[PDB]
Amino acid sequence: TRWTPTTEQIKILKELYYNNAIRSPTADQIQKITARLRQFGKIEGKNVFYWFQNHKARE
Amino acid sequence: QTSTRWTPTTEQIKILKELYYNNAIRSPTADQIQKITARLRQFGKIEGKNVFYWFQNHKARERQKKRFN
DNA sequence: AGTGTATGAATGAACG
DNA sequence: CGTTCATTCATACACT
Ligand SMILES: [Mg+2]
C-alpha cells in the first residue's frame, strides 16, 4: 500500500523543490530529506526519490 | 504500438532474475549476452541491448536503493 | 458509489 | 558506473 504524503510533508517537499531549487536530489539529500519527513509518518528514501523524479517530469 | 520499448515477458524476467541472483551475473560480457539473448528469444522478440540494459539497470538500482535508504 | 484524476511506483533506455 | 529522462502501470481520493 503506497505512501501518501501528509500536508506537512508535501509543504516541505514543495519548499525544497521551489524555494531551494532541488530538482534531482543527490543521494546525500535524499537521506537528509527522508529523515526530516519521517517526523510526520512512515517514509523511506525511495518515496522521496520518486517524489522529485515525478514532480520534475510533470512540471 | 509505435513504441520500440522492449516489453519483457514473465518468463523472460523469471530467467533474468535467476541469472542475476542464482548465477551472480551483474555485467554480462558480449558472449554472455549472446547466449542469454538466444535463450530468451524463445519467448519473445529481444535483442542483446535489451539484456545489456536489464542487467545494467538491475545492478544500478540495487545499489541506488541501498544508497538512498 | 462509479468514475476521473492526480500522483505514487516502476522500468526501459540512455546520458555524463 | 551513478544519474537522468521517457513513458507506462497502479491506485488513493475527490467529485458528482
Ligand atoms: Mg462536486
Numbering used by the authors:
A (entry chain B): 37 to 95
B (entry chain A): 34 to 102
What did the published study say regarding this structure?
The HD transcription factor WUS plays key roles for plant development with at least four distinct and essential subfunctions: Firstly, regulation of stem cell identity in the shoot apical meristem (SAM), where it is required for non cell-autonomous induction and maintenance of stem cell fate via stimulation of cytokinin and suppression of auxin signaling. Consistent with a broad functional portfolio, WUS has been shown to bind to a diverse set of DNA motifs in the regulatory regions of downstream genes involved in SAM development and signaling processes. Here, we have combined molecular, biochemical, and structural approaches to address how the WUS-HD recognizes specific DNA target sites. We find that the DNA-binding preferences of WUS-HD depend on appropriately arranged sequence motifs in a direct tandem repeat and that homodimerization is one of the key determinants to achieve high sequence specificity.
To elucidate the structural basis for these differential interactions, we solved crystal structures of WUS-HD bound to TAAT, G-Box and TGAA repeat probes to resolutions of 2.8, 2.7 and 1.6 Å, respectively. Intriguingly, the TGAA repeat probe was bound by WUS-HD with much higher affinity (Kd = 0.27 ± 0.03 µM; ± indicates standard deviation, n = 3) than the other two sequences. Interestingly, in the case of G-Box and TAAT, one of the two protein–DNA complexes in the asymmetric unit contained an additional bound HD, whereas both TGAA structures only included two HDs per DNA. In contrast, the two HD molecules interacting with the TAAT and the TGAA repeat probes were on opposite sides of the DNA and formed specific protein-protein modifications between each other. One of the WUS-HD molecules bound to the TGAA probe made additional DNA contacts through stabilization of the helix α3 C-terminus by the other WUS molecule, which might explain the higher affinity for the TGAA sequence. In particular, R96 and R100 of the recognition helix established new contacts to the DNA-backbone, not observed in any of the other WUS–DNA complexes. Notably, in the case of the TGAA homodimer, which showed the highest binding affinity, the HDs associate non-symmetrically via the C-terminal end of the recognition helix (α3), thereby establishing additional contacts with the DNA. In contrast, in the TGAA structure A93 contacted the thymine from the complementary strand, which base paired with the adenine of the +1 position. Interestingly, the affinity of an ideal 2xTGAA DNA repeat was similar to that of the naturally occurring TGAA repeat probe from the CLV1 locus (Kd = 0.27 ± 0.03 µM; ± indicates standard deviation, n = 3), suggesting the binding of two WUS-HD molecules per DNA as seen in our TGAA crystal structure.
